[PDB]
Amino acid sequence: KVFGRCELAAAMKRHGLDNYRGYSLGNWVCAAKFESNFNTQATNRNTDGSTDYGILQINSRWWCNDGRTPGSRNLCNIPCSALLSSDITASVNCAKKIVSDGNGMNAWVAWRNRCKGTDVQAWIRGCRL
Ligand SMILES: [Au+3]
Ligand SMILES: [Au+3]
Ligand SMILES: [Au+3]
Ligand SMILES: [Au+3]
Ligand SMILES: [Au+]
Ligand SMILES: [Cl-]
């Protein structure tokens, strides 16, 4: 599913991501925009053989099981395919574990490089929430 910007913002809020670990909703929308262009079915293979899955490009090296990432963990206790669903629940729940792991949203390199310190509120500007 390819979300609209305000559509994603509302789904993220309903699932409790707004101000989760102190990160406003625009942070989460910005991260999703540059991780997946709001496409839930986005996948990208990393050099190290792991894969990133879904709207927030959650990596199989630590967080989900895809059966093809040797020596990896599954800390969200889910199949990576569950992060590709049109329903973002599984991605949100896993993202909450990720952003609580100590480094905040810096876990998402595209957030650090393209969202952090910018006017992230623009991503929710105009949306009915
Ligand atoms: Au904001
Ligand atoms: Au894994
Ligand atoms: Au594996
Ligand atoms: Au923090
Ligand atoms: Au949802
Ligand atoms: Cl949803």
Domains and CATH numbers, the chain: 1-129 (1.10.530.10)
Burial of 81: CB neighbours in 10 Å, binned 0-12, 13-18, 19+: middle
CB 110 within 8 A of CB 35: yes
DSSP 84: G
The one-letter amino acid code at 48 reads: D
**What is the rounded CA–CA span in Å between residue 66 and residue 111?**
24
Which of these is catalytic: 48, 52, 87, 119?
52
Judge whether 66 is annotated as a binding position.
no
**Around Cβ 73, how many Cβ atoms within 10 Å?**
13
Coil, strand or helix at 2: strand
Active-site annotation holds for 7: no
Backbone angles phi, psi at 78, to 5 degrees: -150, 155
DSSP 104: G
Cα(9) to centroid of ligand 2, in Å?
28
Q: What does R_g of the chain's alpha carbons equal in angstroms?
A: 14
Query: Which token pair is 73?
Result: 């963990």
Residues forming beta bridges with residue 65, ordered by sequence position: 79
Please tell me what resolution, in angstroms, this structure has: 2.1
Query: Which token pair is 20?
Result: 């989760």
Active-site annotation holds for 35: yes
Cα(47) to centroid of ligand 5, in Å?
31
**What is the rounded CA–CA span in Å between residue 70 and residue 56?**
22
| Nearest-5° Cα angle at 120, 81 to 93 | 30
